[PDB]
Design an enzyme around this catalytic site. Structure first.
Site, short mmCIF file in Angstrom:
data_model
loop_
_atom_site.label_atom_id
_atom_site.label_comp_id
_atom_site.label_asym_id
_atom_site.label_seq_id
_atom_site.Cartn_x
_atom_site.Cartn_y
_atom_site.Cartn_z
N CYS A 1 0.88 -1.12 0.00
CA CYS A 1 0.00 0.00 0.00
C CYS A 1 0.94 1.19 0.00
O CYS A 1 1.92 1.22 0.76
CB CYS A 1 -0.89 -0.08 1.24
SG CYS A 1 -2.19 -1.32 1.25
N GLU B 1 -7.52 8.95 2.28
CA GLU B 1 -7.20 8.69 0.89
C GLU B 1 -8.35 8.20 0.05
O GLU B 1 -9.33 7.68 0.56
CB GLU B 1 -6.17 7.52 0.80
CG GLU B 1 -4.93 7.56 1.72
CD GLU B 1 -4.07 6.26 1.69
OE1 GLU B 1 -4.61 5.13 1.64
OE2 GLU B 1 -2.82 6.37 1.72
#
Ligand code: DMA
Ligand SMILES: [Mn+2]
EC number: 5.3.3.2
Length: 220
Positions: free
Chosen positions: A79, A141
């Site tokens: 990630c 995000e």
């Protein structure tokens, strides 16, 4: 007081976006992850890779104790975030994000760039979420979910991960139960995907066309 190499990465320039994932600016990784800035709406673009091998096992990593956000947490393959440079700002077919995924797969897990070129990285959909790691650091995000199917070679950087493992579906379940008991910790994005889409995708690894959605941003 934090790990030096991770501190140096806090200077990377992330891509600022509005709530519909339109680029509106750039800001350092440090500033994008301060809860004080998130509290005011600061939002950046990111991606989450889920990599499966031929045996249909998912590759997980345990974040190193040096990571500033969620250290030592078990989570999906990789990630990270596309950087605010010409290559990774590229919006066509989400190429910038797939290039960033290829770059981080090599930097974190030691996967050769050649094994994971953009054409091997499948963009499924986007999820918008917010979380706090601690009183100071957090996340906010719109995360591009990417899927990779390949028997890669690994040579991880211990500064990035303190462990990795391929797990079957049943093995992931025993893992999630251990997280519910406070035995181990998992990241907020992995928790969200695991509780919503992961197992659906995992059952259709051969037919994920019906699971692609480049129009909707799922608000989690
Ligand atoms: C999508 C998302 C949560 C980015 C987090 O990246 P990370 O903390 O796993 O690694 P880094 O921030 O150091 O690239
Ligand atoms: Mn982030």
């Amino acid at each position: 007081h934090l790990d030096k190499q991770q501190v140096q990465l806090l200077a990377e320039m992330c891509i600022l976006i509005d709530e519909n994932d339109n680029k509106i600016g750039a800001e350092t990784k440090k500033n994008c992850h301060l809860n004080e800035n998130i509290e005011k709406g600061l939002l950046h673009r990111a991606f989450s890779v889920f990599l499966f091998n031929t045996e249909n096992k998912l590759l997980l990593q345990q974040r190193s104790d040096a990571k500033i956000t969620f250290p030592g947490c078990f989570t999906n393959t990789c990630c990270s975030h596309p950087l605010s440079n010409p290559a990774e700002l590229e919006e066509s077919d989400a190429l910038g994000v797939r290039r960033a995924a290829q770059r981080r797969l090599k930097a974190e897990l030691g996967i050769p760039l050649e094994e994971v070129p953009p054409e091997e990285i499948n963009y499924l959909t986007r999820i918008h979420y917010k979380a706090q790691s601690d009183g100071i650091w957090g996340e906010h995000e719109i995360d591009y979910i990417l899927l990779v199917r390949k028997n890669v070679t690994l040579n991880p950087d211990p500064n990035e991960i303190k462990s990795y493992c391929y797990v079957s579906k049943e093995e992931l379940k025993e893992l999630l139960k251990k997280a519910a008991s406070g035995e181990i910790k998992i990241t907020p994005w992995f928790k969200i995907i695991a509780a919503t889409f992961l197992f659906k995708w995992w059952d259709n690894l051969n037919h994920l066309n019906q699971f692609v959605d480049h129009e909707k941003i799922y608000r989690m």
